[model samples]
Target: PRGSNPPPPETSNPNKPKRQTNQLQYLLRVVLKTLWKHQFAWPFQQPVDAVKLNLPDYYKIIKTPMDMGTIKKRLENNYYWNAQECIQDFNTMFTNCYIYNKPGDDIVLMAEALEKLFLQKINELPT
Candidate 1:
């Protein structure tokens, strides 16, 4: 059985399924929940403020850089003060997130409107 001509390449195999058995649904859900929980809406208790306060800033920050490391550096240089202060600042920002933007004609309403826009976007993504 030593080198009996290598197995033929599976160029047109019709028996194998296209998709893998383990589509990783659980892992995808975990990641999605983590995204919705931490980055999209943090603190887990204050939904309005958490989502509102971070999004625009996130957009602004990301617009400046395509790399995560550079984005982290940008965030650190702009937002980070100290360990606890940073955490406190983040929490405080979310705690008052509902105050940022509303649905009216003012600038504050932009946040709420943006939230609605994103909700629509989420609805549009394919499963």
Candidate 2:
């Protein structure tokens, strides 16, 4: 067995399934990043700067208080924001406007969709 030739790779397997994990992640990130940028750039003429928001107020409803600093740091470093945090932050930060109901305001939907998509992708991976 020591001298035996190794089998060839599956380059010709016509029915082989390819995993879309990285592609899905890339797309999800793109969607989220685009939305995050849009949230800052276009929509709100008087945007409540994330830095000035009452971060603790959002955490008040949670059993264990999660520090907004960490979330802010992740955002600053271009890492994905937590979905639950996004959902919570958006609700409290922009209470005057219903992000879901506003016409052409798909950022809320995009955020929700990305979270679901990412979760689904994780489930698809081999455990």
Candidate 3:
């Protein structure tokens, strides 16, 4: 014990950019764009005011800190308005891309269903 030295302090790489945040943002953009294109077929109620809004308007509604920090923060903070939550809702709207007509099955939503689909599309992203 006389010559022993304690271990170095724990540290993280400052050079490493926020990779996960970037990935989340990328996935969000893809999901949102897809949903925006298919909004008519989507199950939940979309923003009524967005009826005629284009992709740019949709981007404003769902902008995130990862995409644009200052402008993103100005976005509505409500769970219903947050792009992340909305994307999750859209992705979970159906199971196997269709709703059953059977009793007690018409209203059920498969959670994270779209998230799973997003992960599957990882290979499609630019390397």
Candidate 4:
């Protein structure tokens, strides 16, 4: 932590930017939708019935800091309105792509389900 600069404030990306309204709404919707959509699709080490998943549970489970941080982290890195980007960013954290070259089921599932989940959300998103 020597000579480390303090973290900067969260701000909108001037490049590929959204109107402030769109950016705020995009943030809310994607976080809510991802939480709403993928609550139990991947159970880490536990096996889950993919068909038995429910939407509301996604919101409940997603309230966790880790879950919410992924959204916040990625938005800081890239400003995206498309839900697909949101899903990919979420999975990037969920599956531990943060540490590559040491792959696990969690990572793979995160990658796969992220694609599946985001694809579904994309269909429901507005232009």
* TM-score of each candidate structure, all chains considered together: 0.23, 0.25, 0.28, 0.38
Per-residue CA lDDT of model 3 for 58-119, tens digit only, reads 32333221111111221222213233543343343333223222334432332234335545
Alpha-carbon RMSD, each predicted model: 21.4, 19.3, 18.5, 11.9
Clashing pairs in 4: 35-58, 35-59
Residue lDDT tens for model 1, 21-83: 121232123322333443433332222221445453443332211222222332323432233
What value does the lDDT take at residue 34 in candidate 3? 51
Q: What is candidate 2's CA lDDT for residue 67?
A: 23
In order, how many clashes per candidate?
3, 0, 0, 2
Choose the strongest candidate by TM-score: 4
Off by over 4 Å in 4: 1-18, 21-27, 30-33, 36-70, 73-104
In model 3, residue pairs whose N, Cα or C atoms come closer than 3 Å (at least 3 residues apart or on different chains), thus clashing, are: none
Q: Candidate 2 — which residues are off by over 4 angstroms? A: 1-28, 36-41, 45-74, 78-81, 99-127
For lDDT, candidate 3 versus 4, the one ahead is 4
1-127: candidate 2 lDDT, tens digit per residue: 1222223211233354334344334434543344445433233322323335433332223322222233233334434324443335333433433332353466445434444543554444332
Indicate whether candidate 3 or candidate 4 has the larger TM-score.
4
State the RMSD for candidate 3: 18.5
- For residue 74, model 4's alpha carbon misses the true position, in angstroms, by 6.8
